[PDB]
Amino acid sequence: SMALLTPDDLININMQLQKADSAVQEVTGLDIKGICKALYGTFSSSEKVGIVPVTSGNGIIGNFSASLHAITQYFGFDSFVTDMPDVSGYYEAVQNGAEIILMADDRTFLAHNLKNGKMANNQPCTGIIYAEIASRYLKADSKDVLVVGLGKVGFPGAEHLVQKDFRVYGYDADETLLERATSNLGIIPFDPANPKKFSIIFEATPCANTIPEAVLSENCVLSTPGIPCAISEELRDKYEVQLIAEPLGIGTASMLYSVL
């Protein structure tokens, strides 16, 4: 089984990004650019970005390149999408003066800066930024964070939180992933039968309704790249949960600012 974006996930990406940016600003005091500035020290200066469609594996995803095109323009990069896909697309991008290559198959989504040699992988970049946003919740009043999902996105997020000196509690429905996180990162295994309430939650799972009512507190932040939503509308509304959740753009920003 594979977790991949679908074209419907990406509809009106510009509005999705705007809403996410507003939520990030409300929660943390910074916009997405400022968050990236905090993580990486970098800012955009109209670097040329070539976006190469890839027919590998399950193939080109409807809306995917177009969404990257919009996302990169939104953050102030000089981006373009190649006509040709795959290697012929890569050549086209380089020939047309791209400084950064953005491309993805079903297992890897990367950004490679050809000018300074830095390369980013989407999975850790997404995990780090969504964890960073969570952790900057201005009205948190606590350094306890719950991390749900300790896979390719969730593990690097948890690791980041541990480095930033939060008290990280982690849960993954796969006992082996949980054990790997506790023994490699030193996080506290969360026991769902013995819950406690959090004001900061980071979720990175491909599953609905992973966040149980018992861990919620009023006005808590739930920062989640996971798709579909980790929390029902009912529980979101009931606790006035401040949700940060967007399908591509926040993690893409994290990749781009990390290679500047």
Ligand X SMILES: NC(=O)C1=CN([C@@H]2O[C@H](COP(=O)(O)OP(=O)(O)OC[C@H]3O[C@@H](n4cnc5c(N)ncnc54)[C@H](O)[C@@H]3O)[C@@H](O)[C@H]2O)C=CC1
For binding to ligand X (CB under 6 A), which residues are involved? 3, 122-123, 126, 148-154, 171-174, 177, 204-207, 210, 225-227, 247-248, 251
- Cβ 189 to ligand 2YF, closest distance in Å? 27
Pick from 190, 144, 148: which is nearest to 167 by CA?
144
The one segment of 104-112, 130-138, 165-173, 227-235 that binds Na ion by CB under 5 A? 227-235
Contact 110, 120 (CB under 8 A): yes
Q: Which residues contact 23 (CB under 8 A, 6 or more apart)?
A: 242, 243, 244
The answer to the question of residue 201 lying near Na ion (CB under 5 A) is no
User: Quick count: other Cβ atoms within 10 Å of Cβ 65?
Assistant: 22
Q: Where are the beta strands (DSSP E) in 72-223?
A: 78-81, 100-104, 109-113, 119-121, 144-148, 167-171, 188-189, 200-203, 221-223
Is the CB of 96 or the CB of 209 nearer to Na ion? 209
- Cβ 68 to ligand X, closest distance in Å? 11
Is the CB of 85 or the CB of 223 nearer to Mg ion? 223
Instruction: Say whether 153 counts as a known binding-site residue.
Output: yes
Contact 129, 39 (CB under 8 A): yes
The answer to the question of residue 230 lying near Na ion (CB under 5 A) is yes
- Cβ 250 to ligand X, closest distance in Å? 6
Find which of Mg ion, ligand X, Na ion, none residue 154 binds, CB within 5 to 8 Å per kind.
ligand X
The answer to the question of residue 221 lying near Na ion (CB under 5 A) is no
**Hey, what amino acid is at 142?**
S
Is the CB of 85 or the CB of 247 nearer to ligand X? 247
Contact 69, 49 (CB under 8 A): no
Contact 256, 135 (CB under 8 A): no
The one segment of 38-46, 105-113, 205-213, 215-223 that binds ligand 2YF by CB under 6 A? 105-113
Among 22, 29, 60, 196, binds ligand 2YF (CB under 6 A): 60
Q: What x/- string results for residues 118 through 157 when contact with ligand 2YF is judged by CB under 6 A? A: ----x-----------------------------------
What does 55-97 look like in DSSP terms, one character per residue?
Answer: -STT---TTHHHHHHHHHHHTT-EEEE-SS-HHHHHHHHHHTT
Q: How far apart are CA 244 and CA 201, in angstroms?
A: 10
Q: Which residues are at the interface with ligand 2YF (CB under 6 A)?
A: 4-5, 53-54, 56, 60-61, 64-65, 104-106, 109, 122, 248, 251
